[PDB]
Design a protein around this ligand. Structure first.
Ligand SMILES: [K+]
Ligand SMILES: [Mg+2]
Ligand SMILES: [Mg+2]
Ligand SMILES: [Mg+2]
Ligand SMILES: [Mg+2]
Ligand SMILES: [Mg+2]
Ligand SMILES: [Mg+2]
Ligand SMILES: [Mg+2]
Length: 95
RNA sequence: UGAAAAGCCAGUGGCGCGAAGCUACCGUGUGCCGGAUUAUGACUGAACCCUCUAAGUCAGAAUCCAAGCUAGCAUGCGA
C-alpha cells in the first residue's frame, strides 16, 4: 500500500548556501560549489526555512520510492560536507 | 628436291637452350583507428548497521556497432 505522505527533512548550516531549481541542487561553501542532478527522482525538494532546512517528500509512494528519500538526503548531505570539510581517501601499498 | 648451299615432309620428327607473356607459399609485397557493452570486479547509496542495486555511477572482452575496405540500376541526390 502507498502511504499518503512520507517526508524526511535535514539541517543546512550557515556559510553554506543551497539552491533548488527543479530537482537541480547546487551547494556552495568555502571550498567551492557542488551540483547534483536529481531529475531521475520523483520527489519535491522544499527549502522551508531561510535556507537552513531542506524537506524532501513523496506523495502516494511505495516502499521503493521512500527508499529514495533517504538516498537523496544523504547525497545532499555529501555535498555539504564536501564543500565545508572536503573528502580524503588514504590508500596503502601492500607488497 | 642430280650435287653443294638452301630448304621441306614425318599433324609439334626429336633433342638443347630459349626471350615475351602467363604464372608458384616453388617467388615477392601488404592486410586497419573509435564507441557501446557481456561475464565479472567495483563506487556512492537507501530500503532495514550493512549492502555493486532500489534510484544513480565506474572499469571491462577472440563480443557487438562504427570506422576502414568492396559494390552501389538506391528505377535516390548535388555541383
Ligand atoms: K619466363
Ligand atoms: Mg642439306
Ligand atoms: Mg609430300
Ligand atoms: Mg614423332
Ligand atoms: Mg604467395
Ligand atoms: Mg557500499
Ligand atoms: Mg553489471
Ligand atoms: Mg565503460
Amino acid at each position: 500500500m502507498k502511504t499518503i505522505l512520507a517526508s524526511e527533512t535535514m539541517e543546512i548550516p550557515e556559510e553554506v548556501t543551497v539552491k533548488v531549481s527543479a530537482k537541480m541542487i547546487s551547494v556552495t561553501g568555502p571550498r567551492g560549489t557542488l551540483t547534483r542532478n536529481f531529475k531521475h527522482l520523483n520527489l519535491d525538494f522544499q527549502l522551508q526555512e531561510g535556507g537552513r532546512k531542506l524537506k524532501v517528500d513523496a506523495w502516494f509512494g511505495t516502499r521503493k520510492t521512500m527508499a529514495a528519500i533517504r538516498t537523496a538526503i544523504s547525497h545532499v548531505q555529501n555535498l555539504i560536507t564536501g564543500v565545508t570539510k572536503g573528502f580524503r581517501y588514504k590508500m596503502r601499498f601492500v607488497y
